[PDB]
Design brief:
CATH architecture: 7 Propeller
PDB class: transferase/transferase inhibitor
Assembly: monomeric
Number of helices: 2
Radius of gyration: 20 Å
Strand order of the largest sheet: 10-11-12-13-17
Helix content: under 10%
Keywords: EED, PRC2, inhibitor, Transferase-Transferase Inhibitor complex
Name: Polycomb protein EED
Entry title: EED in complex with PRC2 allosteric inhibitor EED396
Bound molecules: the ligand COc1cc(-c2cc3n(c(=N)c2C#N)CCc2cc4c(cc2-3)OCO4)ccc1OC(C)C, praseodymium ion
Strand content: over 45%
Largest sheet: 5 strands, mixed
């Protein structure tokens, strides 16, 4: 007790960041997304633009190239990075209000292919952590869709009888990509196992190319975590982090305290809430939080330009865990943050088209 506190305090050199740079995008429209390539370079999405930037020494943010959609009415809400499974060259998927996924070559910032589900707004994209070809999209039409971008096939549609009853806003794969947790405007969080016999066969068939699987039932469902819509969800090992508009990110897990995630049945009625990360003034819809590659840091921006950064490695609920980052010129809603794979740079993007670079010192 005393010994472990003396050890924690003695070494303590708390997460500290300093704003080194800031930019404003000429379009003046909100930036909804930002992602560093984890496969130095980051992409931003907003309006009908996808902009590629590179971080340099002396806190410089360098504009590289931009993809401008021919449809000026397109509003991209999300982007995700992958790589070509053969050439190892990077790829970027983007999507938004039109409901079209564009696969962009970031070297030349050109769309090389595109996919359409039912043409409904796409709220988030995520690539499978083990298969660079498997792309998950979540939609305003209440479904999640799994695409094979190597064979251009829609592997599966997650939705139906027991699928989401309203817009799906976010989803995340676990570390091995055996399961997906999704959340949305119907206030629920649903687990979908993609290592089931049915999904393993659908993925194999997709690689032999199409008849898509329609997965009507999740492997777990809950509306017991939040009393309002859930706009962001991420896996934290075998635990889940999710948030609503109640100024808290909730850490939880399906079942009772001792229940193993792989033994949870669809009929499971219990949820264990381990704790919350509290903050203020972030009660507007569609504000994402993010973690670094190694999942040791959690960050969320609020509707007034304040950034919150929590240390996930402090297990003691009493100890200092939260660092707040402000800049007098950053007064707009921070919609998403992204950490560099090295976890030394944190970028925040805003409603007034501004980009904020924070360097970890
Ligand atoms: C068509 O224009 C607008 C659209 C939105 C808007 C934003 C988002 N989603 C929407 N459904 C929507 C809508 N409708 C869903 C996906 C999402 C994810 C986000 C996010 C925002 C969004 O931030 C963090 O991750 C807001 C302002 C607009 O317009 C002004 C620029 C005039
Ligand atoms: Pr610890």
């Amino acid at each position: 007790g005393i010994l472990e506190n003396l050890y924690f305090q003695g070494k303590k050199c708390k997460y500290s960041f300093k704003c080194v740079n800031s930019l404003k995008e000429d379009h003046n429209q909100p930036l909804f997304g930002v992602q560093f390539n984890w496969h130095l370079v980051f992409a931003t999405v907003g309006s009908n633009r996808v902009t590629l930037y590179e971080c340099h020494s002396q806190g410089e943010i360098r504009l590289l190239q931009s993809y401008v959609d021919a449809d000026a009415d397109e509003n991209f809400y999300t982007c995700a990075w992958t790589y070509d499974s053969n050439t190892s060259h990077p790829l970027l998927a983007v999507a938004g209000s039109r409901g079209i996924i564009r696969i962009i070559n970031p070297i030349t910032m050109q769309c090389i292919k595109h996919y359409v589900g039912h043409g409904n707004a796409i709220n988030e994209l995520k690539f499978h952590p083990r298969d660079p070809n498997l792309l998950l999209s979540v939609s305003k039409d209440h479904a999640l869709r799994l695409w094979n971008i190597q064979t251009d096939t829609l592997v599966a549609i997650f939705g139906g009888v027991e699928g989401h009853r309203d817009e799906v806003l976010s989803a995340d794969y676990d570390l091995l990509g055996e399961k997906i947790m999704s959340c949305g405007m119907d206030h629920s969080l649903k687990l979908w196992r993609i290592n089931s016999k049915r999904m393993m066969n659908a993925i194999k068939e997709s690689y032999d190319y199409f008849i898509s699987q329609k997965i009507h039932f999740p492997d777990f469902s809950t509306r017991d975590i939040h009393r309002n819509y859930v706009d962001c969800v991420r896996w934290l090992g075998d635990l889940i982090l999710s948030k609503s508009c109640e100024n808290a990110i909730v850490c939880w897990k399906p079942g009772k305290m001792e229940d193993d995630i792989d033994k949870i049945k669809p009929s499971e009625s219990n949820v264990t809430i381990l704790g919350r990360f509290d903050y203020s003034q972030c009660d507007i819809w569609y504000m994402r939080f993010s973690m670094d590659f190694w999942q040791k840091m959690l960050a969320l921006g609020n509707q007034v330009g304040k950034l919150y950064v929590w240390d996930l490695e402090v297990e003691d609920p009493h100890k200092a865990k939260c660092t707040t980052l402000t800049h007098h010129k950053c007064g707009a809603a921070i919609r998403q943050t992204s950490f560099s794979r090295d976890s030394s740079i944190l970028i925040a993007v805003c409603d007034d088209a501004s980009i904020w670079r924070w360097d970890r010192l």
